[PDB]
Design a protein that fits this description.
part of a larger assembly; 1 chains; mainly beta; two-stranded antiparallel ribbon; 0% helix; elongated; membrane protein; Single-pass type II membrane protein; membrane repair; calcium ion sensor; Dysferlin
Length: 49
C-alpha cells in the first residue's frame, strides 16, 4: 500500500570562491559530491536504477 520506495543518499560539496564570501564547486580540493565521510566521492549522476 502507498508508494513502496528505496532511497539513495549523497552529499553536495561547495567551498568559498577564494574566500571572498561567495561559494561554489570551484576552488574545491575535495570531491564535488561526497558521502557522509567527506572523502568518498558520490556524484548525483553516478547513481543508477
Amino acid at each position: 500500500e502507498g508508494k513502496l520506495s528505496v532511497f539513495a543518499e549523497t552529499y553536495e560539496n561547495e567551498t568559498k570562491l577564494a574566500l571572498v564570501g561567495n561559494w561554489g564547486t570551484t576552488g574545491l580540493t575535495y570531491p564535488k559530491f561526497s558521502d557522509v565521510t567527506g572523502k568518498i566521492k558520490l556524484p548525483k549522476d553516478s547513481f543508477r536504477p
